Every structure is written in structure tokens, then in C-alpha cells.
Amino acid sequence: RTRLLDSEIKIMKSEVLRVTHELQAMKDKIKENSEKIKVNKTLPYLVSNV
């Protein structure tokens, strides 16, 4: 049952990897959402033709 406990602690290591996913997802996402706040809230938009 040693490999089962090894995989049990590896489940916690994969939960730490999920926490790394949560960090590099939420932090980077909200920073890029803040840049889209800076760029996209500029509600007067000149429209035009391509």
C-alpha cells in the first residue's frame, strides 16, 4: 500500500499544481482584465470603415 500513499501525497502535489493554476490563472487574468478596464472603459468610440 506504499504506492497508494505515494499517489495520495501526489494528489496533494497535484492540488498544489491546481493552486499554481489558480494563481497563474486568477492573478494574470485579473491583471489583464485591469488593462482591459484601462483600455475598454473609454466609452466614446469613434466608428469608421475598414
Binding site: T2, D6, K13, V16, V19, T20
Partner: protein, 191 residues
Amino acid sequence: MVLESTMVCVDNSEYMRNGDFLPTRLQAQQDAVNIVCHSKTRSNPENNVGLITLANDCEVLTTLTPDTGRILSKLHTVQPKGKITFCTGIRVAHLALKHRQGKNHKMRIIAFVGSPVEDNEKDLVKLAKRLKKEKVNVDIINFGEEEVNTEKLTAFVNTLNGKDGTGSHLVTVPPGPSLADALISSPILAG
């Protein structure tokens, strides 16, 4: 709570890879880092913990910072390989703690030695009376194998303190099969 700064001094030498100490020696010192980072979470979070090695380099990858979740991420792929130099380890950790943020924090440092170091007792007594003139207690926990009953680090424990500042506690290594938490159970009992 209490204000200090404990610098975990891991060993990344090529002797910490077998399984005489429990299912990985990497996992043994890794659980040691787990219990000391949880112990400094249970201590004052105003305090700070940073990583350093004694072998193959003096590797600073994290700052001596009050966060340790990134240190828990830094547990991975440590790859212990090189050659020990703990005698620069004491001084590199001490200048790392002279690069702190506050002076009201004390200096009780741990160290993990797991290899035969070419450390003169004159070297470590220079370091030890240096710490007598630098106010640091050091609680070293012997890992790996250099001697079944370490003496140079016992001499450093002897030459660090006297009559008032006996904060040098040396868990000598049990080089046969001894557990993962039975080694660190005595410093969590008394550092």
C-alpha cells in the same frame, strides 16, 4: 508569538538521494521544510523564511519573506547533487539575515547537514565567536551521513554559546533507518 528569522539551510548534495532515511531522503528533508514552514506559519507571520543551500553553490531562489506557499512550490525538483560547503553556509545565511527588514526579530536559525564537509574546527570557531559577536543561536539537525556522532558541529554548538545563550541544539544523525517525523519531532519538542 515571538519575533525571529529562521533560515532553512537545505542540503542539495549527492548523498541525500537514497532511502535509508524514509521513502526518499529528498522527501525526508522536504517534510522537514514542510514542518518548519508550517511551524513558522504557527509562529508570528511578521517573521520571514528564505531558502539557501550549502552544497554546490549558495542558492538563493526566494527572498527571506513572510510568505511560504511559493517555498512549498520550490520544494519540487530540488535534485540534490554537488559538494558540501557548510562553512560558507553559516556566513551566507548570516549576511542574508543582515539583509533583513527589522531588528526586533531575533535570530534562531536551523541548518541541515548531510555530507562530510571539509570544515576545520578553527573555521567554525571563527564563525562561532563571530556569532558570539553577532547574537545568533543555531539549531542544526544532522541528516545524511558524515559521522554517526557528529563532532565538528558539536564543537560549533559548544563554541557558539555560554551560560545564557544556549540555543544550540544538535540533533546528530541516526544513520540507520530512522523515521521522517521522529527526527523533527525533537526540535518541534525543543528546537
